[PDB]
Amino acid sequence: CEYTDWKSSGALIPAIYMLVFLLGTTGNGLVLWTVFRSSREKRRSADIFIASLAVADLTFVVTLPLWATYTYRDYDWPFGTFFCKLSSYLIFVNMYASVFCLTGLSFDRYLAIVRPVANARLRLRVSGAVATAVLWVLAALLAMPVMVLRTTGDLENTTKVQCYMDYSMVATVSSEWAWEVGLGVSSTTVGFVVPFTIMLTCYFFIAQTIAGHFRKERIEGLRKRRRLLSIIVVLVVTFALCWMPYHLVKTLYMLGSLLHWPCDFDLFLMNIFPYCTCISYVNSCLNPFLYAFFDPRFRQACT
């Protein structure tokens, strides 16, 4: 299996990186500016949630052109060592923040939709900015080892330094891959496996309530039921079609490190992984259109 990587990984990857940076920056900036405009007018219980998602998205895409240039220079990172650490930590913090804010907005919607009596009496706190603050702090603590372990070192003496992350600072060389597998498993679990379950159960309860209330007997009722179920399923589908690639491929790689999958499959995984990251940014790029811009009230606030 003396195969390194697909050739286009150095040509198209910077291009799509730059392009999705453009789209994400434009969309997130416009939605955040309109949210800042309408924060004192709409007074939505989840305006803070979409605002936190937008700022997380900004900070997610700002450092992406660094990887665009890094992949343009094959696999060399010339921006710097501390810059490598800062970009990796920022992107991981924004990763966790985006997922946690999406599930927090799901929980807010469940509390304000399924039971507007007592679930709202528990929603009074998740509606305040304290929930966003604790979510951000928790995400920062989860992404802390990325800062702690990120470094910059040249490998194979190619005089072309890569933005890898050091591990000998805290972990042994012998159990090094074991420590890395543990870190990856913890990241995947605490970042997707639990929060995605909260999101899906919240939206399933919301769909159950909407289906129970709205009926086909009303011409407007059936259309509104179809529209609401459509947006809910589109949201869950975009989540479970954007986040399966990255985390699924990474978990498959971790499993293969202990299952002896054929080497060709391993090479295929490491080659598709940048595309998986591209899909990861694309998720956050289309997130504002699916959360804020989808709201007619948000649209009329824009206009």
Epitope: D5, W67, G153, L155, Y164, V173
Partner: nanobody, 130 residues
């Protein structure tokens, strides 16, 4: 960590052929790629062929186009089918395995900058005749 033993060392004259194989335990292309390093008696340990993300055919300039390495994850073996023995090729070949860097944004590279602190073999003194 990874246990790996070289196999070979038969005496072959100048211009001969032999396959140097090092079998590792707990070393997969996914996790731990493997490399080949030499020891001529009273010399310094130079690389032979290294399995890295860049190039992927990191054969030493002295042995470019003549030696042939082969890493097989299925049978956890590192073939080195050298060609054309020279008396200078008499060396104690240390097969070494180092882990692979992360995939997130590193690129799944083999940390050959940590080879000295990694896992070297016992080394097999391949005998070469003329």
């Amino acid at each position: 960590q990874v246990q790996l033993v070289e196999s070979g060392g038969g005496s072959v004259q100048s211009g001969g052929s032999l396959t140097l194989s090092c079998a590792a335990s707990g070393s997969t292309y996914s996790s731990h790629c493997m490399g080949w390093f030499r020891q001529a008696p009273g010399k310094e340990r130079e690389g032979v062929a290294l399995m890295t993300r860049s190039r992927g055919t990191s054969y030493a300039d002295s042995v470019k186009g003549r030696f042939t390495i082969s890493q097989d994850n299925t049978k956890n073996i590192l073939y080195l089918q050298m060609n054309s023995l020279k008396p200078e090729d008499t060396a104690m070949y240390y097969c070494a395995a180092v882990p692979r860097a992360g995939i997130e944004y590193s690129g799944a590279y083999c940390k050959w900058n940590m080879k000295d602190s990694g896992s070297w073999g016992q080394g097999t003194q391949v005998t070469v005749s003329s």
